[PDB]
Design a protein around this ligand. Structure first.
Ligand code: PC1
Ligand code: 3PE
Ligand code: 3PE
Ligand code: 3PE
Ligand code: 3PE
Ligand code: LMT
Ligand code: LMT
Ligand code: LMT
Ligand code: LMT
Ligand code: LMT
Ligand code: LMT
Ligand code: LMT
Ligand code: LMT
Ligand code: LMT
Lengths: 98, 83, 171, 142, 105, 115, 345, 120, 172, 48
């Protein structure tokens, strides 16, 4: 358990680094936001199982429920960004500086 | 009251999937209300003994708690055998 | 900080009930209705005490009655019993419903030979009351004294002296 | 943690003494501000290259280091030539030397004037703070 | 909460599964139910600031049951001291620790 | 352990057949053989260019309905509760709002593919 | 959007903060933060043009990343203590990561660069919602854990926000940016006093909301986004100049307007705790707000900028705005200082 | 500060014990100023809509004055109770911890030597 | 078998390292499937079952959609792979070096606290009702229908509203 | 094993309370063969 949380927590940090360090595609930054959901879900699942807290096992499911909605809303926005410039490159989303 | 029959016959002819879907959806919400067995669903689940029935200390003021399990007192599952 | 107190290996010695699960399960219903009082006191000890070291005597009387119960079957109904559990052992979930025919023969041996009646459906899961002379523990959690509450303040409300007292506002 | 211990070595001994130890500390302290400044500078207003990026980091950190080294020396030198340790005017002279260094490195007489005054006053108030025990980030009392 | 509506209406939307010792399905206690139930009863009514000092005994025990830092430490030391003895050659485990016990029952 | 063994055995067979397929045949490689296929003529552009998805709205509506499966899959355990009235009422509502959500999308031409 | 969508979307926008505010459990507090994030997105991007799409995208990736960090705190805390609420014994680093994430959600500097741009790409009424109602949920979480917050992180964020909000707003000709930087500066005041007296953070929030609401309503009256657009108010809705000016001075903290009360009481309570240096810089940089608020007042009520010919048609027509709420919020947001003792406590 | 004090009901506007406090006078300087803030609102409303400022819509103006005095009356009653509670808790604390708020004997000026600062 | 869980969490870590370097979303979706599968095996090792298979099921449908969106909106002529660019290839290799270093280092300065390589496996399952019957994670997750019904209201409403939310976002 | 280790109290608890705390699997099979430990961690879950 000790070794697992450290590896899981560092997994969350790597995805937070991935999310905070953009490249071209906006879709790739969306997949890092799913790397974070997966890390958090696995931590919560292991925590609840290790402590035998069955009443907390609903909570990991809601994380998946409220993580899909973001993935859906994120993908819906990615469609509107593509319908404007023909790609999902972030460097195009810069009109608002002025 | 007269036009509805025309509509329902129309939908039933050309859209039976939806007419079947609404009927089954609505029939599933009525059947628990009127069945004379809906009450046993809870009872049977409550009568299934997963945890150990931890005995209680007999102080002396327990005239309706069996001493031995084969006593004539306590919850009985005859209604379930003969269900 | 303390030294956990453990019983010595010779405090934990009893005569074991070294029979397979099918043997127990075949005799489970009669045994529940025969060794009940002894069994029901150990469980009371265990839930009341919340300590396995405090019930190492009631728990050796559990083994005392379980062995007596099997000695009564090894002297009246050995073969009807051996056909039954040997057939209960075959199934991969050891289900009663595949041996209702051998089960009947074993029941019609204990009943006539020993007077034993199989408990009905639902009787073994009842909550019974057990009488014992063991004292009731009063601090089973070994808890300390709960810290005092913050003392309450007595009195009736009066208007705030000179009002809000907020800078230069008078009222 | 050690790195906190090092920056508290600056106030173990009365001002004007252990002069190089203090000059070293404020030189590192200035460098840390220069590095933090560059990090935001390069990230928010990125350069056209990567060597040109690193150059800006070096230019800010040496300038920030230079200000800190001129402050921590001039303060400790003045504080012992005048033999007046517990004195804010020492930190005003050091803070201004820091301000002069900033203008010198920036090719701006105007910055030197602003830097000499603004930083000298900021340095003086830091000294007056330690004498009177003002806390930057106090903890909730009431 | 910031708007104690649940407390006002007397309902419980999410108040009843806040901690380990809460009710579990089929009366299955959680790990460290005893310790937590002690800590929450110790720190009840005295407020957070008093509880941080006056229920330190209950808390440090619950924290030890939940995370077992001292237990792993202690069992690390016993195993590491035995590793050292066995390399030298001053200790051979018992038969019941080397896979040759007489099993119970 | 068995379930790990049986799947490595499956993987090793799939690997083993893969190796035999590549190192057993007699291979004669030249550029015109290894070009991409397009009915006998040269491709006019790479196959990595964008490919418009005319059912994208249904694709993301699959995600929302996919997670609503994750909420109905505990039901086999849930019909074992004493609180049968509650379990059933929550189940009926859940399926009914999935249906109400589906009806809204259907009537909004959401299930129709974009032309 | 059809009435079903509005009912569903506007209910969800309202629902989010109420779930966060009424919830004992942290995961339900997080759930409310998700409802607000998801349901505002369709509102922001309704006009569907290149600028609102960028605005709704920058907002989503910012607020989703901040959500994941908050959730990590809620989960690392459940690992440490087996509970779904922050305790006095919660690890220190768990609390700080919650603070930085929530400030990222509020727009506090240095996590602020998103807010002025998002406010710029969206319509005025959704800027009102975003700069007001959307701040209550993150703030209600923070007020629930104020005994635990590290004050050094809170004061550096507040000092930064007051400075950046002042400097940022000084350079803006777009009204929507002037409102975003106005927001950033005021959040600095709410946050600076949070670990000391959370009640004063609610006073400063409420007074800011009733000042920021009519100000948006005033710009929504003629749909005026620039300083030159708002300069035509003397020839369009001159009846509005009397209350625009006071509200701008009130937003500036000038006495004897209601907006002086929040700054004055926060400074007073900060120095009850010996927070002298921070308090002095905060009040000294709040002066910069008044300068670019004064510049706006110069352009609208205290001078008459050149007007155009087509504005004569505008005068022949009859307006049905503003509503009865604008007048009620304008008076209460400016002429309520004599009721100060009834507002603080 | 006072959020978690004993007996504190949740989301109770005017607890019962507030009824032992004298009510705000109807013509309270604070209530009267509410009446004027209401009247101005009605005037500002007419101004913004281009109507006669004082003649127009007296039903509205009456209801603005009534609304603000009505609400101000009950809001004032709550702040009196909150202020009454503050003193109540403040003084009962002084009583329960006397060793922390010691009475002090202040010397008279006969015994005090204030330094003299000449103004030359 | 004592290193089993440690290896699964180590594989999970890499899958998110590869994911963080962000090659073409075709491969980023491949890392999420393998991390999703690896993570599923961890929840299984710790005694879970329903929670393990669900997160695997849900992420299988998510990457199906994500694949459809990549080929339509996030595809360029020369999709990047982890070996495509020398600089990314450097940080993937270097990233693995660091963990071999961080684990070895942090294991040296505490020996038990964080990483206890000396005692991998000894501390996986703490307690377990050996004579239990009702212990599957499904029973705990199923409590949403009786005890934590509030969880399901917000979850159901989240999904219900989302259909309305996306239909408006994507509307022409 | 730990006769000659300074400041070691054999059998010392790690808890201030004197209530009976059931042992963990690691406390219980920790001085036995790894096969026993692997069995207790994965015996049920890997049987199929
Ligand atoms: C089943 C197939 C396994 C046997 C053939 C393996 C082919 C091979 O690698 O040849 C050895 C290789 C040659 O590979 P190869 O290129 O000749 O493989 C082609 C196989 N045949 C000849 C049947 C067409 O020897 C070497 O030079 C390197 C070792
Ligand atoms: C237009 C141009 C003129 C501009 C005038 C600017 C006014 C600025 C007012 C600043 C606040 C000062 C007044 C607040 C105050 O302290 O009054 C307190 C008042 C007390 O009541 P009072 O009768 O006035 O005297 C004590 C007996 N009760 O009770 C009150 O609180 C009354 C509050 C309403 C004040 C009118
Ligand atoms: C704690 C709060 C964090 C500090 C606030 C971060 C603000 C960062 C920022 O806005 O910097 C932008 C600025 C622009 O960079 P640039 O124009 O190239 O520098 C001058 C060019 N001659 O970049 C800069 O050069 C500003 C210098 C850094 C100031 C912030 C860090 C100071 C810490 C010491
Ligand atoms: C806490 C609340 C924070 C304020 C959040 C803003 C909520 C209102 C959202 C909005 O859209 O505001 C604009 C609203 C629209 O009304 P209107 O301008 O008259 O135009 C359409 C009517 N036919 O115009 C309004 O009526 C705004 C009224 C704001 C009420 C603030 C109360 C405090
Ligand atoms: C602005 C600068 C003024 C600063 C000083 C604030 C006080 C001046 C405002 C006076 C308003 C007022 O007091 O009217 C309320 C009056 C009740 O006054 P009362 O409580 O009897 O005694 C207070 C004596 N100061 O009751 C009344 O008679 C008012 C009813 C008529 C109002 C028209
Ligand atoms: C240090 C070993 C530990 C593992 C390290 C990897 C952690 C994960 C980091 C993920 C982010 C990668 O960080 C990366 O930063 C580089 C700049 O360096 C940026 O990348 C950008 O510049 C680089 C350099 O020219 C280009 O190769 C790249 O195509 C472009 O997008 C992106 O913002 C991000 O892709
Ligand atoms: C003990 C007190 C000592 C006081 C002196 C210390 C403070 C010195 C401040 C130097 C300030 C900047 O220093 C001054 O910068 C100018 C910038 O105009 C540069 O000057 C040089 O370049 C500029 C262009 O910018 C030309 O116009 C100028 O003719 C040329 O000399 C030099 O670098 C220096 O002349
Ligand atoms: C009682 C009244 C007292 C009056 C005091 C008069 C003393 C003035 C001494 C100032 C001497 C320093 O002189 C300094 O000259 C530079 C000329 O570049 C001016 O500054 C100007 O040039 C600088 C370059 O250095 C640029 O940043 C900018 O174009 C402008 O600020 C400064 O504003 C002034 O401070
Ligand atoms: C160039 C102009 C700049 C003007 C400022 C001049 C700065 C030069 C002085 C160098 C100061 C070194 O900064 C040093 O920071 C440490 C950080 O703990 C302070 O430390 C102080 O605060 C900490 C709080 O964390 C206390 O716990 C500690 O007991 C106390 O010593 C030192 O008191 C201060 O001396
Ligand atoms: C917004 C979406 C709404 C659309 C969906 C609406 C669904 C509504 C479903 C209502 C059906 C509930 O049906 C209800 O079932 C419960 C239990 O199942 C029955 O209840 C009965 O059985 C239970 C146990 O099963 C007994 O403990 C109880 O005493 C007895 O009344 C009710 O007599 C019946 O009325
Ligand atoms: C704004 C909050 C207050 C309102 C509260 C919510 C209740 C609203 C009740 C009025 C409902 C009217 O909402 C009704 O929505 C439907 C879809 O659902 C719209 O109808 C739409 O779908 C139908 C499907 O057959 C098609 O004709 C077409 O695609 C479109 O018109 C109607 O045009 C509108 O009349
Ligand atoms: C319990 C549930 C709580 C429900 C809360 C409801 C809050 C009130 C929401 C009010 C929303 C109406 O407010 C909004 O008004 C603006 C005008 O300012 C309209 O916005 C308008 O902007 C410009 C000009 O104004 C037009 O070009 C545009 O097409 C139109 O949308 C919106 O179409 C309407 O949505
Ligand atoms: C995707 C890449 C995945 C690769 C991940 C790495 C796989 C290898 C696991 C390395 C983890 C440590 O692996 C192994 O752990 C054991 C116990 O668990 C350590 O410890 C072992 O030896 C020590 C002495 O050193 C003794 O106490 C005992 O025999 C045992 O504990 C070993 O020294 C180490 O070799
Ligand atoms: C306006 C937006 C919101 C409207 C929509 C939401 C309406 C609320 C619907 C969800 C209702 C949940 O309803 C709530 O259920 C929980 C458990 O599920 C009950 O709570 C119960 O929990 C467990 C049950 O085992 C007991 O230990 C506990 O003592 C008891 O209170 C509450 O008494 C009931 O109020």
């Amino acid at each position: 358990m000790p070794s697992t949380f450290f590896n899981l927590t560092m997994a969350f940090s790597l995805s937070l680094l991935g999310t905070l360090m953009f490249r071209s595609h906006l879709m790739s930054t969306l997949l890092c936001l799913e790397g974070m959901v997966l890390s958090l879900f696995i931590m919560t699942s292991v925590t609840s199982l290790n402590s035998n807290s069955m009443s907390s096992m609903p909570i990991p499911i809601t994380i998946l429920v409220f993580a899909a909605c973001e993935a859906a809303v994120g993908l819906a926005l990615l469609v509107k960004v593509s319908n404007t410039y023909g790609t999902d490159y972030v460097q195009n989303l810069n009109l608002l500086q002025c | 009251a007269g036009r509805i029959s025309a509509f329902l016959k129309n939908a039933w002819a050309k859209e039976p999937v939806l007419v079947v879907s609404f009927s089954v959806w609505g029939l599933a919400i009525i059947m628990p209300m009127i069945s004379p067995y809906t009450k046993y669903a809870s009872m049977i689940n409550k009568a299934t003994p997963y945890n150990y029935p931890v005995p209680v200390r007999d102080d002396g003021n327990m005239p309706d708690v069996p001493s031995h399990p084969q006593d004539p007192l306590g919850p009985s599952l005859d209604w379930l055998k003969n269900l | 900080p303390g030294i956990v107190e453990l019983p010595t290996l010779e405090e934990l010695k009893v005569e074991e009930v070294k029979v397979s699960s099918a043997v127990l399960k075949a005799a489970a219903h009669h045994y529940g209705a025969q060794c009940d009082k002894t069994n029901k006191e150990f469980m009371l000890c265990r839930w009341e005490e919340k300590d396995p070291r405090r019930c190492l005597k009631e728990g050796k009387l559990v083994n005392g009655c379980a062995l007596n119960f099997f000695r009564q079957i090894k002297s009246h109904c050995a073969e009807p019993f051996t056909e039954y559990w040997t057939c209960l052992d075959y199934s991969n979930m050891q289900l009663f419903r595949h041996c209702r025919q051998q089960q009947a023969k074993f029941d019609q041996c204990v009943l006539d030979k020993l007077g034993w009646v199989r408990p009905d459906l639902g009787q073994l899961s009842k909550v019974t009351k057990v009488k014992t002379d063991r004292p009731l523990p009063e601090n089973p959690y070994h808890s300390r004294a709960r810290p005092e509450p913050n003392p309450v303040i007595e009195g009736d409300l009066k208007p705030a002296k000179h009002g809000t007292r907020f800078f230069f506002w008078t009222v | 943690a050690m790195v906190k211990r090092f920056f508290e070595s600056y106030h173990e001994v009365p001002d004007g003494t252990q002069c190089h130890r203090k000059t070293y500390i404020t030189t590192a302290l200035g460098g840390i501000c220069g590095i933090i400044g560059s990090a935001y500078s390069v990230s928010l207003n990125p350069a056209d290259s990567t060597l040109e990026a690193v150059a800006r980091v070096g230019r800010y950190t040496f300038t920030a280091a230079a200000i800190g080294a001129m402050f921590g020396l001039t303060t400790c030198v003045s504080a012992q030539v005048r033999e007046k340790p517990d004195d804010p005017l020492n930190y005003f002279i050091g803070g201004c030397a820091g301000g002069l260094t900033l203008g010198a490195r920036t090719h701006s007489y105007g910055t030197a004037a602003m830097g000499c005054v603004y930083m000298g006053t900021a340095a003086a108030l830091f000294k007056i703070g330690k004498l009177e025990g003002w806390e930057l980030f106090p903890t909730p009392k009431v | 909460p910031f708007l104690d509506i649940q407390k006002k209406l007397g309902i419980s939307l999410d108040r009843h599964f806040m901690f380990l010792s809460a009710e579990q399905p089929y009366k299955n206690a959680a790990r460290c139910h005893a310790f937590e139930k002690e800590w929450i009863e110790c720190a009840h009514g005295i407020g957070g600031t008093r509880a941080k000092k006056e229920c330190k005994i209950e808390f440090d025990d619950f924290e030890e049951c939940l995370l077992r830092y001292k237990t792993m430490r202690r069992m690390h030391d016993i195993k590491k001291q035995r590793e050292k003895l066995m390399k030298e050659g001053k200790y051979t485990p018992p038969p019941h620790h080397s896979g040759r016990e007489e099993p119970r029952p | 352990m068995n379930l790990y063994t049986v799947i490595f055995i499956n993987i090793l067979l799939s690997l083993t057949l893969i190796l035999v397929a590549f190192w057993l045949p007699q291979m004669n490689l030249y550029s015109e053989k290894a070009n991409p296929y397009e009915c006998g003529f040269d491709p006019t552009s790479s196959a990595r260019l964008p490919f418009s998805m005319k059912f994208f709205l249904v694709a993301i509506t699959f995600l929302l309905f996919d997670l609503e499966i994750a909420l109905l899959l505990p039901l086999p355990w849930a019909i074992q509760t004493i609180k049968t009235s509650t379990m059933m009422i929550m189940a009926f509502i859940l399926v009914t709002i999935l249906s109400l959500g589906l009806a809204y999308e259907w009537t909004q031409k959401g299930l129709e593919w974009t032309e | 959007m059809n009435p079903i969508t509005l009912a569903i979307i506007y209910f969800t926008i309202f629902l989010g903060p109420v779930i966060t505010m009424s919830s004992t459990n942290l995961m339900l507090m997080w759930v409310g933060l998700e409802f607000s994030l998801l349901a505002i997105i369709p509102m922001l991007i309704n006009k569907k043009n290149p600028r609102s799409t960028e605005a709704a995208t920058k907002y989503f990736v910012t607020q989703a990343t901040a959500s994941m960090i908050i959730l990590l705190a809620i989960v690392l805390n459940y690992k440490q203590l087996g509970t779904w609420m922050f305790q006095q014994q919660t690890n220190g680093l768990i609390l700080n990561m919650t603070l930085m994430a929530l400030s990222m959600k509020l727009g506090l500097a240095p996590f602020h660069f998103w807010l002025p741009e998002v406010t710029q790409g969206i319509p005025l009424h959704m800027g009102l919602i975003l700069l007001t109602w959307q701040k209550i949920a993150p703030l209600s979480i923070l007020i629930q854990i104020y005994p635990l917050l590290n004050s050094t992180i809170i004061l550096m964020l507040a000092i930064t926000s007051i400075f950046m909000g002042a400097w940022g707003g000084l350079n803006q000709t777009q009204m929507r940016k002037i409102m975003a930087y106005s927001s950033i500066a005021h959040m600095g005041w709410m946050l600076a006093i949070l670990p000391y007296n959370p009640s004063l953070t609610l006073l400063n929030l409420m007074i800011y909301i009733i000042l920021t609401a009519p100000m948006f309503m005033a710009l929504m009256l003629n749909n005026s986004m620039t300083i030159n657009s708002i300069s035509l108010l003397w020839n369009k809705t001159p009846a509005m100049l009397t209350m625009i000016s006071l509200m701008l001075l009130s937003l500036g903290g000038l006495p004897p307007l209601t907006g002086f009360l929040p700054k004055w009481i926060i400074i007073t309570e900060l120095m009850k705790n010996n927070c002298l240096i921070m308090a002095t810089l905060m009040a000294m940089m709040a002066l910069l707000n008044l300068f670019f608020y004064t510049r706006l007042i110069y352009s609208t009520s205290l001078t008459m900028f050149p007007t155009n010919n087509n504005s004569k048609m505008m005068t022949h027509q009859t307006k049905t705005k503003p509503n009865l709420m604008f007048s009620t919020l304008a008076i209460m947001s400016t002429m309520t200082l004599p009721l100060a003792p009834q507002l603080i406590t | 500060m006072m959020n978690g004090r004993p007996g504190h009901e949740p989301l109770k506007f005017l607890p019962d014990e507030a009824r032992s406090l004298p009510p705000p006078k109807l013509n309270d300087p604070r209530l009267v100023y509410m009446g004027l803030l209401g009247y101005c609102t009605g005037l500002m409303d007419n101004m913004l809509r281009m109507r006669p400022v004082m003649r127009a819509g007296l039903h509205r103006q009456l209801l603005f004055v009534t609304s603000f005095v009505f609400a101000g009356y009950f809001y004032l009653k709550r702040q009196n109770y909150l202020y009454a509670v503050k003193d109540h808790d403040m003084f009962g604390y002084i009583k329960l911890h006397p060793e922390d708020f010691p009475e002090k004997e202040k010397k008279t000026y006969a015994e005090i030597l204030e330094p003299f600062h000449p103004v030359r | 078998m004592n290193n089993y869980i440690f290896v699964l969490s180590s594989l999970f870590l890499v899958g998110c390292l590869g994911l963080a370097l962000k090659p073409s979303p075709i491969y980023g979706g491949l890392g999420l499937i393998v991390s999703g599968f690896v993570g599923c095996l961890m929840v299984l090792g710790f005694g879970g079952s329903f929670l393990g298979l669900m997160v695997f099921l849900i992420y299988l449908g998510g990457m199906l959609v994500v694949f459809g969106y990549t080929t339509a909106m996030a595809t360029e002529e020369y999709p990047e792979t982890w070996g495509s660019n020398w600089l990314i290839l450097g940080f993937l290799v270097l990233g693995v070096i660091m963990e071999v270093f961080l684990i070895c280092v942090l294991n040296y300065y505490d020996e038990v606290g964080v990483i206890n390589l000396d005692g991998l496996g000894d501390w996986l399952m703490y307690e377990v009702d050996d004579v239990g019957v009702m212990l599957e994670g499904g029973i705990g997750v199923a409590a949403m229908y009786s005890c934590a019904t509030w969880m399901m209201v917000v979850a159901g409403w989240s999904l219900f509203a989302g259909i309305f939310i996306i239909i408006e976002i994507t509307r022409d | 094993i730990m006769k000659d280790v300074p400041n070691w109290k054999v059998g010392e608890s790690v808890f201030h309370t004197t209530r009976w705390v059931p042992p963990l699997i690691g406390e219980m099979y920790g001085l036995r063969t790894k096969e026993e430990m692997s069995n207790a961690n994965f015996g049920f879950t890997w049987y199929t």
